[PDB]
C-alpha cells in the first residue's frame, strides 16, 4: 500500500491526476481521477492543451469496438472512438488489464491548460456510463479481471497558496489507494454512510449546521435531487434554496468585511495582505450524513479554508487571494474536491458505503479543527432522501 501513497497530483482547481500506462508497449499518460463519471477516456489526437496523446497505431493490443461515444460533463464535453487496450497503473497495484478506452477526437472545454492531465478516469458506477451501462467502467474491469479488492480510498491534499502547473509537477496533492485503506493516511475513526444508489456515489444529507446554527430547512431540500461525492468537481455545489441559505448565513458571519456580491457567486477573487487573512470571520459548516445504523448519523465539519480557495496574483504584488468555492447547482448537492480535501474518503463499493475520516494532510487553523464526529441521533432520516 505504501507503493500507492502520494501517487496523485493536482489541485482543486484543475483536478488530481494519476499516472497510467496504456497499450502495448505501454504509453505513459496522466489521468484525472473522477468519481463523478464512470467513463474512462483519453486524448488520442494532437491538441493545443495536450503534451501527449494516445496513439492506438502503436499499441499492438489496441482493439477496436467500431463504436463512437459522446460524453457529457457539467463543464466539458467530448466524443470519441470506443476501443479496448491493456491498461495499467505503475503506482497502483501490480496488475494489467484490458479495459474499454475512448480515444477522444473532438472536445469542448474538456481539457484544461497546464492541467498536466491528458485523460479522465470515471470511477462511478455503470449506470451512468456512455453510451450505456453495457460498456463496463474501468474499475469494474479491474476487479473482474483480478484479485484487487473492490474498494478504493482517496486522500486529497490541498495547497496553502496557488500552485503553478510547473510547480504542481514538483508539488504532490494526494494518495489514491486501490482495493485498500492505508491507516497511516488518517486519524481517528472512519465513519460510514450508505450509498443510496449505485450510479453516482449518491448520499443522503440529514442536517446542516453553520457555526452550530441549524439551517432547519427540510432535509429533502439538501438532497434535491441528489447529493453525490465527486472528485470531478472543484467546488461544493448546493441546490438553490440551500445555497442561498448558506450564503446569507455566511455573509452575516463575515459581514464586517466588504466583498463584491460578485464574489459570492464566485466570479471574482478577494485579496488580503499576505498573512493577514481573517479566517475567523468565516463559518464552519457541518454536514450530517446517514448512519449505517437505525436513527444514526454523523457529521463532518468544514473550515472555510476548505471552501475558500487560493488563486494566484492578479497583480505583481503578493496579497493572498482567494475565491469562493461554493456554487449554486440545479442537479443537487455535490461534495467536490474542496470538501474531500479535508478527509480520507473511502469508497467501499463492496460494502456499498462510503467512509470519511480526518485526512492526515489536513490544513491548519490553530483554533479550529476539521473533524468527523459520531454518533448522532437523527429521526426519519430516509424522509430526507428525495423522490419525485
Amino acid at each position: 500500500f505504501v507503493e500507492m501513497v502520494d501517487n496523485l497530483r493536482g489541485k482543486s482547481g484543475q483536478g488530481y491526476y494519476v499516472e497510467m500506462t496504456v497499450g502495448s508497449p505501454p504509453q505513459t499518460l496522466n489521468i484525472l481521477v473522477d468519481t463523478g463519471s464512470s467513463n474512462f477516456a483519453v486524448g488520442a489526437a494532437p491538441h493545443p492543451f495536450l503534451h501527449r496523446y494516445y496513439q492506438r497505431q502503436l499499441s499492438s493490443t489496441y482493439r477496436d469496438l467500431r463504436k463512437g461515444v459522446y460524453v457529457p460533463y457539467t463543464q466539458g464535453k467530448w466524443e470519441g472512438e470506443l476501443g479496448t487496450d491493456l491498461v495499467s497503473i505503475p503506482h497502483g497495484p501490480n496488475v494489467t488489464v484490458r479495459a474499454n478506452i475512448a480515444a477522444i477526437t473532438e472536445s469542448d472545454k474538456f481539457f484544461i491548460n497546464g492541467s498536466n492531465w491528458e485523460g479522465i478516469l470515471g470511477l462511478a458506477y455503470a449506470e451512468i456510463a456512455r453510451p450505456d451501462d453495457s460498456l463496463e467502467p474501468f474499475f469494474d474491469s479491474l476487479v473482474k479481471q483480478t484479485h484487487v479488492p473492490n474498494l478504493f480510498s482517496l486522500q486529497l491534499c490541498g495547497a496553502g497558496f496557488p500552485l503553478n502547473q510547473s510547480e504542481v509537477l514538483a508539488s504532490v496533492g494526494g494518495s489514491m489507494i486501490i482495493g485498500g485503506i492505508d491507516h497511516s493516511l488518517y486519524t481517528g475513526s472512519l465513519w460510514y454512510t450508505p450509498i443510496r444508489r449505485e450510479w453516482y456515489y449518491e448520499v443522503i444529507i440529514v442536517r446542516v449546521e453553520i457555526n452550530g446554527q441549524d439551517l432547519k430547512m427540510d432535509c429533502k431540500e439538501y438532497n434535491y435531487d441528489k447529493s453525490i461525492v465527486d472528485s470531478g468537481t472543484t467546488n461544493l455545489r448546493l441546490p438553490k434554496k440551500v445555497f442561498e441559505a448558506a450564503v446569507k448565513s455566511i455573509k452575516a458571519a463575515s459581514s464586517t468585511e466588504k466583498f463584491p456580491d460578485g464574489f459570492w457567486l464566485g466570479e471574482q477573487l478577494v485579496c488580503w495582505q499576505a498573512g493577514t487573512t481573517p479566517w475567523n470571520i468565516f463559518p464552519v459548516i457541518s454536514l450530517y450524513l446517514m448512519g449505517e445504523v437505525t436513527n444514526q448519523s454523523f457529521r463532518i465539519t468544514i473550515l472555510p479554508q476548505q471552501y475558500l480557495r487560493p488563486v494566484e496574483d492578479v497583480a505583481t504584488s503578493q496579497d493572498d487571494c482567494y475565491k469562493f468555492a461554493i456554487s449554486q447547482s440545479s442537479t443537487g448537492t455535490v461534495m467536490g474536491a474542496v470538501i474531500m480535501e479535508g478527509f480520507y474518503v473511502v469508497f467501499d463499493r463492496a460494502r456499498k458505503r462510503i467512509g470519511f475520516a480526518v485526512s492526515a494532510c489536513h490544513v491548519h487553523d490553530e483554533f479550529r479543527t476539521a473533524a468527523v464526529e459520531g454518533p448522532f441521533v437523527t429521526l426519519d432520516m430516509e424522509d430526507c432522501g428525495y423522490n419525485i
Binding site: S12, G13, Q14, G15, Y16, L32, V33, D34, T35, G36, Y73, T74, Q75, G76, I112, I120, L121, D230, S231, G232, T233, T234, N235, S327, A337
Partner: peptide, 4 residues
C-alpha cells in the same frame, strides 16, 4: 474550476 473543474465540473466533471
Amino acid at each position: 474550476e473543474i465540473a466533471x
